[PDB]
Amino acid sequence: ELRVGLEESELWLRFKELTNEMIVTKNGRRMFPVLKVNVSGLDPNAMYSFLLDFVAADNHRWKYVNGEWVPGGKPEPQAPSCVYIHPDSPNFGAHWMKAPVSFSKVKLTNKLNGGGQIMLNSLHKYEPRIHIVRVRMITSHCFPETQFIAVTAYQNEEITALKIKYNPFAKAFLHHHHH
Ligand SMILES: *[C@H](CC(=O)Nc1cc2c(Nc3ccc(F)c(Cl)c3)ncnc2cc1O[C@H]1CCOC1)CN(C)C
Ligand SMILES: [Zn+2]
Numbered sequence: 001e002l003r004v005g006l007e008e009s010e011l012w013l014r015f016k017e018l019t020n021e022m023i024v025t026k027n028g029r030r031m032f033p034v035l036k037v038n039v040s041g042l043d044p045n046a047m048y049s050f051l052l053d054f055v056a057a058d059n060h061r062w063k064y065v066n067g068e069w070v071p072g073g074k075p076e077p078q079a080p081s082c083v084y085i086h087p088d089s090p091n092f093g094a095h096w097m098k099a100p101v102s103f104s105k106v107k108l109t110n111k112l113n114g115g116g117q118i119m120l121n122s123l124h125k126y127e128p129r130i131h132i133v134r135v136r137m138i139t140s141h142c143f144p145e146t147q148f149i150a151v152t153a154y155q156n157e158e159i160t161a162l163k164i165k166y167n168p169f170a171k172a173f174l175h176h177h178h179h
Pocket of ligand 1: 051080081082083113131132133138140
């Protein structure tokens with residue numbers, strides 16, 4: 001029985017509860033927390049490739065006013081992002097099931113989608129989606145705890161405090177809306 005579990009799901013929930021945010025830049029930024037999954041139930045001798053893309057969690061824009069996230073805008077549907085190929089692809093099912101599969105090197109951008117860079121629209125809520133392709137029978141896997149709003153700068157200052165607390169790299173690289 002094919003099973004895909006989320007690694008460090010409780011840490012993801014700390015950001016999930018406050019509505020997670022991820023920075024997008026012209027050159028791209030790594031995610032925090034990193035997406036890692038545990039896979040069981042593959043054919044260990046078959047060949048598989050692991051793919052990652054980001055789907056719209058909803059079809060409207062978002063704003064952060066008065067210390068809370070508010071929907072808005074005429075809902076225009078957003079197409080999924082480009083796919084990022086896990087660098088170990090293709091590989092045996094035994095390779096994917098021996099250790100957590102990590103997508104730590106993916107970089108989210110708002111400009112250039114080539115290679116390890118994924119282009120996202122600012123102020124939209126995205127959800128990572130993992131594709132396992134037998135080397136084409138495809139299975140797709142997502143986790144609501146990993147949803148986030150792509151932003152060019154951190155809106156919720158509580159998120160900034162969480163990122164600084166748990167991401168060791170946040171400290172090395174370390175206006176409000178009202179009406
Ligand atoms: C983004 C580039 C991109 O993703 N290109 C691309 C994707 C692709 C896929 N994608 C895919 C989508 C959903 C899904 F569930 C799975 Cl398992 C896979 N699958 C197969 N081959 C692909 C090729 C590909 O590209 C190469 C082919 C054409 O150019 C290079 C572009 N955005 C506009 C979406
Ligand atoms: Zn989902």
